[PDB]
């Protein structure tokens, strides 16, 4: 979720993960990706 995403160094994003991150879970009731 958003909390554990960001506390782990990830970002909750709605489109493709930006360079140097990749999908590791979701945020925002499953509608965004946790890019980490």
C-alpha to C-alpha distances, 22 to 5, 30, 35, nearest whole angstrom: 12, 16, 5
Q: Is 26:14 a contact under the CB 8 Å cutoff?
A: no
Which single residue is written with the structure tokens 């990830």? 10
Specify the resolution in Å: 1.5
User: What is the DSSP annotation of 1-36?
Assistant: -HHHHHHTT-EEESSSPPTT--EEEEETTTTEEEE-
Tokens 């960001």 appear where?
A: 6
Residue spans of the domains in the chain: they are: 2-35
Experimental method: X-ray
The rounded distance, in Å, linking the Cα atoms of 22 and 17 is: 6
Sheet with 32-35, strands from edge to edge, namely 11-13, 32-35, 23-27
Residue 18: what are its φ and ψ, rounded to 5°? -75, 170
Strand partners, 13: 33
- Give me the sign of the Cα torsion angle 30, 32, 33, 36: negative
């Amino acid at each position: 979720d958003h909390y554990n995403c960001v506390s782990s160094g990830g970002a909750c994003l709605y489109s493709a993960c930006p360079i140097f991150t990749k999908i590791q879970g979701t945020c925002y009731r499953g509608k965004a990706k946790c890019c980490k």
